[PDB]
């Protein structure tokens, strides 16, 4: 799809058997999702944003289907206010900015 | 330009007579710039992000030239870690996401 930016660029994702909405976020290096149940091993990580830092769990080689396109990569899980799809996964679905 | 997302989507901006770099950020509703000298009246505002909230100064009808495209709108100035161009200005330069 082409997506204009008059509204938040939200898409449906399927991850860990669950359906969620997430923001396509070109300002995010990495993918950060709200607390959710994910299977397997993880590693503690601190990440920074506009108002300071949060502690997240780092999960590698996680499958995510983003608006019907499959990607596999790192997902960070923690107290983010919104689910964010970052460039680590946007590059896999072929996402570009155009003006 | 078409911009792929293997690197941060940074562009040159000119605002308040100054040259700066800023991130084209589809996950940002509003435009937030690092402390800088802007002329005229402003209004206190608190905005929230990944790690909590920051106090910004709200400036309206500010001219910004974003990668050679002119836009006029609200700019928030405050302790953001990075200069962010949000959807309020991305819609004016015709920016879209495509996959
Ligand atoms: C969380 C997200 C929903 C909104 N944020 C835009 C994201 O793109 C921000 C932009 C950004 C902020 C700080 C920073 F150091 C680097 C980049 N990205 C973000 O938090 O990403 C984090 C995390 C993602 O992976 C890595 O890449 C950058 C770091 C790092 C951890 S925001 O907090 O910066 C933001 C920006 C503009 C806004 N305008 C508003 N307006 C409200 C009044 C609605 O809220 C805003 C909130």
Author numbering:
A (entry chain A), B (entry chain A): 1 to 99
The authors write:
The inhibitors of HIV-1 protease (PR), an essential enzyme that cleaves gag and gag-pol polyproteins into mature functional proteins, are the key element of effective cART1,2. Blocking the activity of PR leaves virions in an immature state, which are unable to infect cells, thus leading to restoration of the immune system. In the present studies, we designed and synthesized seven novel PIs that incorporate the unique 6-5-5 ring-fused crown-like tetrahydropyranofuran (Crn-THF) as a P2-ligand as in GRL-142, GRL-121, GRL-001, and GRL-003.
Crystals of PRWT complexed with three protease inhibitors (GRL-002, GRL-004, and GRL-063) as well as those of GRL-1421, GRL-00114 and GRL-00314 exhibited virtually the identical binding modes, which were found stabilized by a conserved hydrogen bond network. The transition state hydroxyl group of all the PIs examined forms two hydrogen bonds with each of the catalytic aspartates, Asp25 and Asp25′; and on the opposite side, with the so-called “flap water” coordinated by the main-chain amide N-H groups of Ile50/Ile50′. However, no definite difference was observed between the potency of the mono-meta-fluorine-containing inhibitor group (GRL-001, GRL-002, GRL-014, and GRL-015) and the mono-para-fluorine-containing inhibitor group (GRL-003, GRL-004, and GRL-011). No major difference in cell permeabilities was observed when the fluorine was at the meta- or para-position. All four Abo-containing PIs (GRL-002, GRL-004, GRL-063, and GRL-015) displayed reduced permeability compared to the six Abt-containing PIs mentioned above, independent of mono- or bis-fluorine moiety. Of note, both isopropyl and cyclopropyl groups protrude at the edge of the S2′ site pocket where they heavily interact with the side chain of Lys45′ and to a lesser extent with Ile47′, Asp29′ and Asp30′ of PR. From a structural point of view the isopropyl moiety containing a wider C-C bond angle and two extra hydrogen atoms apparently fits well into the entrance of the binding pocket. However, the tight fit of isopropyl does not contribute anti-HIV-1 potency as much as cyclopropyl group. Obviously, the isopropyl renders the inhibitors bulkier, preventing their adaptation to conformational changes induced by amino acid substitutions in HIVDRVRs structures. Benzothiazole-containing inhibitors performed overall better in their antiviral activity compared to benzoxazole-containing inhibitors. Cyclopropyl-containing inhibitors exerted greater antiviral activity than isopropyl-containing inhibitors.
